[PDB]
């Protein structure tokens, strides 16, 4: 029973609210370690909590691996986005983070710690602004500014540290020394003047991916991503990811969940309570599966409930009602199907002869109000009005779940088991183009005309 409810505050095995905001995760041995920070009462750094788990749903409290007592500096400061990486050679765990005075944000510096054990008390080292000795000046202070940060371990066992420099306008990817505890050089200056923060660096199949989240304080914004074959250069443009608010959250870390069947990259972010005028500790979490259509095309769907099976390594949507359905048209007598039963995103939806195929089976997930989400079985995408069109003849396709109103449908009973399925965006019904009665009939969107080609019957399976 590994189901997670997004937009809420998870609870550990003890029954207490988990407090690991802006944190990350590490997979070592047989355990997944969730690190993160949380303010106390003065909105200052209290400690960096640590949770262990095997199922990724039931978390176990392990205490503060880093405390405000670990160092004199930590007695009064701001610490955000603490990440931990493993060093194969040494056998210890290096921890990076973002450090501030607690009075202001002039001290854009990073901080380092480490420990022989994962859930053990880390020993604070030093806070500093990278590249201090080079003598380079960044806004009046020694060393490049370093705010929003994150860590990454390449296949060749080389450590990397990413952070926002030059007033969060540029992203600096620093290459770490073999011990991961120091900066060896500035690998590359990525996305200059683009002003991206909250970076997440990962790799899949010889391709590096960089997930960002613009920069709009607490208020959620349009998240984007990019790819490249090399960390040094060859980076692509910023392609939009998720919706206009990243599903009311901000990216924090992305970890590959490997299992028996395969690997499913997990996305996790924060729904900062600051959005509605709340303390950091009241912030909620949002976990979603990061799907890869292709080596150059990424997908970040929004599932109100996510099911995870770490053992098999599968992250998919949780369907409250497993009841299958097929939508038969009154006029043609054919059922709703996906063109060529394809599972390619944005696939055209067409009518087809009832052949008991998977492509002709659909779930009905309630999404509030009198509207519902029509999801396919073979693929798992939702019925979507292409490009949120509000005009007649608007093609219907199956697209990644994005909580858009162009994916919510209301059923209006007209009798004899037939309904008029209207969209929540404009209110136009699901229409069979040109009253087609043959296979491959294009399913579209059209205003209510009282036609029989607009009436659909709900049939169990």
Please, what's the largest Cα pairwise distance for the chain? 80
Separation between Cα atoms, residue 382 and residue 244, nearest integer Å: 19
When binding is defined by CB under 6 A, the residue of 5, 215, 388, 426 that contacts ligand IPT is 388
For ligand IPT, give the closer residue by CB, 297 or 311: 297
Any contact of residue 332 with ligand IPT (CB under 6 A)? no
Q: Is 387 annotated as contributing to ligand binding?
A: yes
Nearest to 245 by CA among 387, 390, 402: 402
The encoded tokens of residue 385 equal 């009005």
Q: What part of residues 395-434 is at the interface with ligand IPT (CB under 6 A)?
A: 399, 402, 404, 406
Q: Give the pairing of strands 362-366 and 394-399.
A: unpaired
Please say which residue, 286 or 383, places its beta carbon nearer to ligand IPT: 383
Q: Is 199 helix (H, G, I), strand (E, B) or coil?
A: coil
Min CB(387)–ligand IPT separation in Å: 5
**Minimal distance in Å, beta carbon 388 to ligand IPT?**
5
Binding segment (CB under 6 A) for ligand IPT, from list 50-58, 132-140, 357-365, 379-387: 379-387
Is 203 a residue that touches ligand IPT (CB under 6 A)? no
Q: Which is nearer to ligand IPT, 342 or 402 (CB)?
A: 402
Q: Which stretch binds ligand IPT (CB under 6 A): 210-218, 298-306, 362-370, 382-390?
A: 382-390
Give the interface segment with ligand IPT, choosing from 51-59, 149-157, 385-393, 434-442 (CB under 6 A). Answer: 385-393
CB 327 within 8 A of CB 454: no
Choose the stretch contacting ligand IPT; rule: CB under 6 A; options: 76-84, 295-303, 365-373, 380-388. Answer: 380-388
Task: Among 44, 319, 343, 346, indicate the residue that binds ligand IPT (CB under 6 A).
Answer: 346
User: Alpha-carbon distance 149 to 159, whole Å?
Assistant: 14
CB closer to ligand IPT, 107 vs 423: 423
Answer yes or no: is 366 a known binding residue: no
Residue 307 sits in the site that holds ligand IPT (CB under 6 A): no
Nearest residue (CB) to ligand IPT, 147 versus 424: 424
Say if residue 384 carries a ligand binding annotation.
Answer: yes
Residue 376 annotated as binding site: no
Which residues of this chain interact with ligand IPT, rule CB under 6 A?
346, 384, 386-388, 399, 402, 404, 406
Binding residues: 384, 387, 402, 406
């Amino acid at each position: 029973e590994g189901v997670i409810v997004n937009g809420t505050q998870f609870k550990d095995t003890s029954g207490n609210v988990i407090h690991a905001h802006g944190g990350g995760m590490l997979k070592h041995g047989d355990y997944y370690y969730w690190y993160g920070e949380y303010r106390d009462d003065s909105n200052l750094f209290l400690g960096v909590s640590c949770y262990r788990s095997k199922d990724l749903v039931n978390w176990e409290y392990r205490g503060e691996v880093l405390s405000r007592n670990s160092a004199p500096e930590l007695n009064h400061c701001n610490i955000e986005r603490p990440k931990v990486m493993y060093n194969a050679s040494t056998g210890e765990f290096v921890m990076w983070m973002h450090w501030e005075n607690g009075i202001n944000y002039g001290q854009a510096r990073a901080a380092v710690a480490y420990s022989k054990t994962p859930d053990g008390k880390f020993t604070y080292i030093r806070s500093f602004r990278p590249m201090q000795d080079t003598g380079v000046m960044d806004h009046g202070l020694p060393g490049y500014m370093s705010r929003d940060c994150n860590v990454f371990v390449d296949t060749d066992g080389k450590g990397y540290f990413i952070s926002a420099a030059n007033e969060n306008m540029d992203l600096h990817l620093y290459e770490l020394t073999p011990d991961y505890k120091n900066i060896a050089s500035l690998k590359a200056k990525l996305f200059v003047g683009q002003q991206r923060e909250a970076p997440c660096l990962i790799k899949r199949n010889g391709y590096y991916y960089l997930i960002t989240s613009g920069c709009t304080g607490w208020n959620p914004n349009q998240a984007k991503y990019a790819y490249s074959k090399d960390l040094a250069s060859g980076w692509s443009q910023l392609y939009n990811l998720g919706n206009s608010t990243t599903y009311r959250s901000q990216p924090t870390f992305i970890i590959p969940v490997q299992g028996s069947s395969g690997t499913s990259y997990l996305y996790m972010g924060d729904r900062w309570a600051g959005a509605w005028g709340g303390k950091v500790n009241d912030s909620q979490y949002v976990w979603l599966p990061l799907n890869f259509i292709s080596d150059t095309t990424l997908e970040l769907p929004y599932y109100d409930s996510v099911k995870i099976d770490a053992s098999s390594g599968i992250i998919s949507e949780y369907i409250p009602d497993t009841t299958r359905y097929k939508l038969v048209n009154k006029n043609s007598g054919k059922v709703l199907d996906v063109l060529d039963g394809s599972v390619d995103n944005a696939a055209q939806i067409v009518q087809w002869t009832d052949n008991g195929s998977l492509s002709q089976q659909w779930y009905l997930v309630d999404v509030g109000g009198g509207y519902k989400k029509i999801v396919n079985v073979k693929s798992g995408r939702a019925l979507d009005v292409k490009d949120e069109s509000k005009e007649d003849g608007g093609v219907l396709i199956q697209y990644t779940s994005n909580g858009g109103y162009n994916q919510h449908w209301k059923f209006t009973d007209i009798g004899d088991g037939y309904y008029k399925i209207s969209s929540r965006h404009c209110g136009k019904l699901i229409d069979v183009r040109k009253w087609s009665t043959e296979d491959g009939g294009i399913i579209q969107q059209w205003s209510d005309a009282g036609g029989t080609n607009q009436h659909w019957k709900l049939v169990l399976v």
